[PDB]
A paper describes a structure:
In particular, the 19-residue D-proline-L-proline based peptide (CP1) showed significant 60-fold improvement in binding affinity (KD of 50 nM by SPR) towards H1/Cal and 60- to 440-fold improvement in binding in AlphaLISA (IC50 of 0.052–0.84 μM) against H1 and H5 HAs. Binding of CP1 also resulted in more stable complex formation as compared to LP1, showing 9- to 180-fold slower dissociation (koff) or longer half-life (t1/2) of 5–46 s, with good neutralization activity against H1N1 and modest activity against H5N1 viruses. Molecular interaction analysis of the most potent peptide in the series, CP1, in complex with H1/PR8 HA revealed that Tyr97, Asp99, Leu100A, Val100C, Ala100D, Met100G and Tyr102 from the peptide macrocycle make a series of polar and non-polar contacts with the stem region residues HA1 His18, His38, Val40, and Thr318 (HA1 residues in italics throughout) and HA2 from Asp19 - Trp21, which form a beta turn, and helix-A residues Gln38 – Asn53. Polar interactions include direct and water-mediated hydrogen bonds and also interactions with a fucose on the N-linked glycan at Asn21 on HA1. Backbone carbonyls of Val100C and Ala100D make direct hydrogen bond interactions with the side chains of Thr318 and His38, whereas the backbone amide of Gly100H mediates hydrogen bond interactions with the His38 side chain via a fucose residue on the N-linked glycan at Asn21. The structure of CP1 bound to HA strongly mimics the intramolecular interactions of the sdAb38 CDR3 loop54. The Asp99 side chain is oriented towards the inside of the peptide macrocycle and makes intramolecular hydrogen bonds with backbone of Gly100B and Val100C to constrain the conformation of the peptide loop and allows peptide recognition of HA2 helix-A via hydrogen-bond interactions with Gln42 and Thr49. Similar to sdAb38, Tyr97 and Tyr102 make direct hydrogen bond interactions, respectively, with the backbone carbonyl and side-chain carboxyl of Asp19 from HA2.
Here we report a unique, efficient and effective structure-based strategy to design peptidic modalities based on a single domain antibody. This strategy was used to graft the relatively long and flexible CDR3 loop of the single domain antibody sdAb38 onto dipeptide templates to design mimetics that can potently bind and neutralize influenza A viruses. To elucidate the structural basis of binding and neutralization of influenza virus by the PMD-based peptides, crystal structures of the neutralizing (template-based CP1 and CP8) and non-neutralizing (non-template based CP14) peptides in complex with H1/PR8 and H5/Viet HAs were determined at 1.59–2.87 Å resolution, respectively. All peptides recognize the hydrophobic surface and embedded cavities at the interface of HA1-HA2 in the HA stem region. This region is highly conserved in HAs across influenza A groups 1 and 2 and influenza B viruses, and the target of HA stem broadly neutralizing antibodies (bnAbs), including sdAb3854.
Residue numbers in the entry:
A (entry chain D), E (entry chain F), G (entry chain B): 1 to 171
B (entry chain C), D (entry chain E), F (entry chain A): 11 to 54, 54A, 55 to 83, 83A, 84 to 95, 95A, 96 to 125, 125A, ...
C (entry chain H), H (entry chain K), I (entry chain G): 1 to 19
The structure:
């Protein structure tokens, strides 16, 4: 993808994270597990809902459209009616298929960028209190309990409260 | 102690296409293309369609004896012809401006069939019992239920002049016919006038008809021909028929009420006690999706017809378990 | 079951977060 | 010491829509949809339109007595009819191929109205003063300004044959009429001959007309009818009228000059001394925008009509003060 | 947004920066204030001008188009004419609306990208002579006068001339 | 020691446009717009077109004497008229429903020209030698090759009635004419019946014709006129001609075979021994590109016509040497 | 571009790298030279091939379409036929030109993304064993010979193998 | 007022940088 | 010449990697 996160430096997805499109995996001494990012998933759901609803609303309702009949000396008019019907059908089939393709590409990139931005947010919070171990994972230079993890999740990580412990552990 | 950032994966096998890639398996997607119908003809917002069955528009409006069940019908939401709608004109000839009459009926929601020239009182000086074997009914020779074959009475066909004033407050569809015998002996035996003419006039209609006598190839064992004509009489206007032969007079006419959203379709499906907002010749559609690939012919409020075999929008992520 | 984590009126997230 | 990277914010309340979000307030945007017109009919590149007013195309070209102010007009940029343009054919009947004639006039930029058969010298053996109360003028009975009702003179209607050679170097539009009396007594009184006929021929036109006598419902207190015909005479070609009754002869014809970009519209607006490049039935447009939602009917160089209520393109940033 | 700067790690806009779409805020002891990046703003204006011009020029002028008249026996031809008119109107309304929507999305992403790239080039110049403070701000490990700030803005920051001083103060 | 990340640059001068920037030089790109044709008329999947040359459809089907080399042609892939296809109707008049006949021929792949009424045996009691100087051939007066001018024999034109039963298993195109002399004396001299008529009937066709005598302006030195009619006789059906004057009888007819993908084009190009899948009036196209800007008129399987001057997709990088 | 690599922090392209869209330049004491990244170039070629074939296959084929003829009393029908032909031609010209423009923009951004992601993956591999000297180039804090360079290209860079040598030379 | 910081023939940046 | 570094059926990479 354009942003290099999904199928990129985060090689695979998590079947064990059943509650959200994006989220976290934690492993401290208190244990291990997944924590879905519910706010980002809800924001993405709102965006994609708007997208699908846009596609549906731009296609206004198709009211009654039936064939017409022409006598044996109206072959030109019959063929013109046929040309009109077929041209409109060509154009609408083209528009539908191409819109779906382009929006699919945009949606995949949208999710890719969401994951990349989540990763960068955690990185900006952690600074040198943790190391980048690749595959989207960080390793803390200190003890981080479940409330420390949750403060990483909601964007209130306390860097000064662990700076000393982690620069002694970083040596 | 570790924290990792990741994304969802599930058991989905849904695949979508992009411009750069085909068959991308994704966690979540939604179909935008309706391909399911119920296979039934249904009511349109509670109003049942008019099923012509073995008859077509012509047999219905003229009163082909095979279409007698259709006579008391008064309102409908759309008109259904079948591939077997062959009973139309029984006596061979030309239905003039027939396609225009069908286009007119496509915007008619109801009508009143009424007697415009009562048989037993409008034509005292002419015979009205003319029938033919081309319009058989139950084995016997008969004729259209809405028209009257006027013939000579006691060896004479006097000049007739009959009129009707439209007091229905609605347009009135009036149909008549003109008979063209195969030879002048039939012309004289039937109408006792060899230089016959017909004149049909309204305030905005004005036509004269002259019989064209000649022997034609036999269609339904008839060498004569019969041409069929129609007009719309405006409210308060009068129609006048004047003739000294060959007039296939109107007996019943139709006071029309106009409506929107109706039409004529050809369908092989059967009527059920269902209600829909979208009817196609293959079946009814009940869907909120924007596109369908079921049929280009639609009545009501339907999705847009496209030739696509698949329109699937990705909503979730690339699925990488 | 009867409870969902997300408001998803179009079914865009399928059965995700649904209990 | 600090340095920061940031983006613009202002007081703008402009909102746009995107596919992921609606009503994004943005710092700068541009409207692409024109919705302002001046409410006036204007000249088109300096050339005023032809306003028919109470008359329609038929009353104009035939010379309905209610349309005498339109006789001296010669050039125009487009043609305007109003919802009250009802003075057309005053003697009832049918204008044959009238819609095709309007389509022909849609590409005429100017013409010369000229006397093709002068009243005082072209019909010495016929009366030329026939009038009717259906085409009244200032209380008195009158007739079309461009046609001539030829009648019997001294109890005789001799066979007439008059021709005209197109020396104008331009197409010549020629209009005539055929009169159909209600009864044979009026036919004999007006034209003496009961088996009358009219023949109109050019190098590429060829038609014969037969009177159809019958009593019609009264329209404008006339039981007779009058059918109106027209043709285009090619430069250097000759038109021949031959008759022994019922001919409504041409008196004035039109030498046509063709142009591009003109048309006929129906409008309730009023003429001002304005100039425009784009005219709609609601008003003139003065815009460089690519779209408009004012009216689908356009004359000149106009934006593309769309049903949209808003087409706003964001040019600046998401506005977060 | 896709690139996470606008309404992202730079949470708000600057009403005090009135002369450009993107720019800087400086704070040294000679004072504080805003500095619009006029060249990036000008290149963005060029791009957006090309975009608007493209939409306008693809929609070439609509020459005379009026209604037609049909007699009472030409209802089929009349209905064909209005089917043609209405189908073309449907297609053009759809085209206009969705073109505007998609290009609006792309324009917002374009500005997001420009801000992110400006931030990244400043970071690339500063290296370890400054610390990242979040919200798009840097804090110098040394003294940076107005000419030094302009050095950062024009792409001519002298890293060696402050390297020693800032690794003294960095400790 | 250093490692760098970089991208390709080359000597390409290919430029593309984007929405944000014009004339972007790129390393690699592909053209999607076909602008090259071969300038020739070629065969379509091995089958040569029908070249009418100096003749148009009318001259070909009636058998204009200038079109004799077209008499033996039996099959074709498309039909080519030129800007000089002027030899059609040689005796002036109206070809009725001519455009519909051209539209019909647009779906004919082959036919068999056959003698429907042999000259020496179908009209014993009439003269069949009528020729005209309007249809000259090699200096002498002549006539259409597929029609026969029936005239009085020994002072009499008896009432004729002739029939043909379609045993071809295919539609048969039958053409005939009706002569309208300029004066009563020519009518008498040619057909010796002043009240003449023609009747043409099938099971689904029914028309009667009456001569219209009048002096017309001279076209090709002819003051008379000749109207041309046609019909399609269904397999197994019978056509009957009945007349006592003025019938230009059929002599040869066409048993039509239908096909797909043909049409009639006008073109100035020359025929070569060349095979194509796509033919335009300017030349043949041999391309797998999706668009072309050569000509909107296409025969076969062609790219989509557009007004674009350039459609170039970038495939590589922005080129920065 | 959106991702800031092409014509961005990598100011120009390499005429000397003739065998690939993206790649590397190496400089050790074994010598100098270019190394195209063939797998990423092949992936990009696959994507762009799919894109071009998508355009081509969405356009289908234009079967026989010829003019029609109308007599002198069929001017309305003639003009309706002209309106139909001209409207369809307008729509298809607009669709073709706009699709080409939009996909051109997307293609350039796709390539920009690929270069940016290549750079970021090399940086992720090197970590502190090398310095960022701008212009997309890294400078190793140790000796890296031709197979160490191939180790960087193939994704198999051994960080612990040069960890200590480069921390010593980094001082 | 009369002087603009930017070349903006289409009015794409409104009054920004306008003096 | 006869050998290509890449599979490029539509020719979208021109003569790149072609020998
Ligand atoms: C496939 O998995 C589903 C579980 O839901 C999936 O995972 C979600 C996170 C989301 O991605 C959905 O779109 C996916 O469909 C199984 O269905 C559920 O299983 C749970 C088990 O605890 C059960 O309680 C629910 O009632 C089930 N709900 C539904 C709607 O099925 C499903 O059984 C799996 N199918 C197979 C074949 O393994
Ligand atoms: C809203 O603000 C404008 C200032 O222009 C805005 O800010 C720019 C940076 C740019 O974003 C433009 O697109 C915006 O329109 C005020 O108008 C200006 O006021 C000054 C007073 O010093 C005056 O000299 C200018 O001429 C004004 N500019 C214009 C274009 O009129 C305006 O007063 C503000 N409105 C409100 C309601 O607060
Ligand atoms: C322009 O350069 C080409 C070489 O190919 C270019 O570089 C590739 C990496 C790729 O980007 C292609 O798309 C480019 O076109 C020259 O063509 C080759 O020229 C050499 C001359 O030594 C010759 O031996 C090769 O056979 C040529 N290539 C082929 C496929 O035959 C071309 O000559 C250059 N043009 C100019 C004007 O210098
Ligand atoms: C984290 O976020 C939650 C949700 O708002 C909140 O309850 C909590 O107080 C925050 N802080 C910590 C330390 O968890
Ligand atoms: C790929 O998708 C196409 C249609 O999108 C389908 O016909 C084909 O079977 C798919 N192939 C695979 C391997 O899934
Ligand atoms: C959002 O925009 C729509 C139309 O685009 C409008 O009807 C609605 O009032 C807007 N909502 C707000 C909160 O401004
Ligand atoms: C449109 O407005 C401009 C600006 O006022 C004016 O110069 C021009 O004359 C106007 N055009 C018309 C046709 O009125
Ligand atoms: C910075 O760039 C500006 C732009 O022209 C230039 O005037 C100046 O000399 C450059 N250098 C410094 C140190 O400001
Ligand atoms: C820019 O491109 C246009 C068409 O895309 C062309 O007409 C013009 O000559 C080009 N200009 C330059 C300087 O290349
Ligand atoms: C690097 O990857 C290539 C890929 O085939 C492999 O051949 C090689 O053994 C790997 N290791 C090194 C040190 O190059
Ligand atoms: Ca009919
Ligand atoms: Ca009329
Ligand atoms: Ca004709």
């Amino acid at each position: 993808g354009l942003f290099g996160a999904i199928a990129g430096f985060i090689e695979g997805g998590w079947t064990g994270m059943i509650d959200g499109w994006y989220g976290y995996h934690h492993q401290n001494e208190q244990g291990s597990g997944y924590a879905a990012d519910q706010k980002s998933t809800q924001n993405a759901i709102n965006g994609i809902t708007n997208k699908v609803n846009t596609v549906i609303e731009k296609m206004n309702i198709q009211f009654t459209a039936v064939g017409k009949e022409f006598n044996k000396l109206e072959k030109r008019m019959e063929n013109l009616n046929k040309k009109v019907d077929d041209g409109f059908l060509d154009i609408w089939t083209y528009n539908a298929e191409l819109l779906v393709l382009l929006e699919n590409e945009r949606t995949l990139d949208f999710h890719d960028s969401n994951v990349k931005n989540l990763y960068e947010k955690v990185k900006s919070q952690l600074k040198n209190n943790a190391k980048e171990i690749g595959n989207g994972c960080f390793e803390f230079y200190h003890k981080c309990d479940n409330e420390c993890m949750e403060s990483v999740r909601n964007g209130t990580y306390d860097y000064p409260k662990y700076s000393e412990e982690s620069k002694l552990n970083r040596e | 102690d570790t924290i990792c950032i990741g994304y969802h994966a599930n058991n989905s096998t849904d695949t979508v296409d992009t411009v750069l890639e085909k068959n991308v398996t994704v966690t979540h997607s939604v179909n935008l293309l309706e391909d399911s119908h119920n296979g039934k003809l249904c009511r349109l917002k509670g109003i049942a369609p008019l099923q012509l069955g073995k008859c077509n528009i012509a047999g219905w409006l003229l009163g082909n004896p095979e279409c007698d069940p259709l006579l008391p019908v008064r309102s409908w939401s759309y008109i259904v012809e079948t591939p077997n709608s062959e009973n139309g004109i029984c006596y061979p000839g030309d239905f003039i401006d027939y396609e225009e009459l069908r286009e007119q009926l496509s915007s008619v929601s109801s009508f009143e069939r009424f007697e415009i020239f009562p048989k037993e009182s409008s034509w005292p000086n002419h015979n009205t019992n003319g029938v033919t074997a081309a319009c058989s009914h139950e084995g016997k020779s008969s004729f259209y239920r809405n028209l009257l074959w006027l013939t000579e009475k006691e060896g004479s066909y006097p000049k007739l002049k009959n009129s009707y004033v439209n007091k229905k407050g609605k347009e009135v569809l009036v149909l008549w016919g003109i008979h063209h015998p195969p030879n002048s002996k039939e012309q004289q035996n039937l109408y006792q006038n060899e230089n016959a003419y017909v004149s049909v006039v309204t305030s905005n209609y004005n036509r004269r008809f002259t019989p064209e006598i000649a022997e034609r190839p036999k269609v339904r064992d008839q060498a004569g021909r019969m041409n069929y004509y129609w007009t719309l009489l405006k409210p308060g206007d009068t129609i006048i028929f004047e003739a000294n032969g060959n007039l296939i007079a109107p007996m019943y006419a139709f006071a029309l009420s106009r409506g929107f959203g109706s039409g004529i379709i050809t369908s092989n499906a059967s009527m059920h006690e269902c209600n829909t907002k979208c009817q196609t010749p293959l079946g009814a559609i009940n869907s909120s999706l924007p596109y369908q690939n079921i049929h280009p012919v639609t009545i009501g409020e339907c999705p847009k017809y496209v030739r696509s075999a698949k329109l699937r929008m990705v909503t979730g992520l690339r699925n990488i378990p | 079951x009867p409870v969902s984590l997300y408001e998803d009126p179009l079914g865009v997230a399928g059965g995700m977060g649904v209990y």
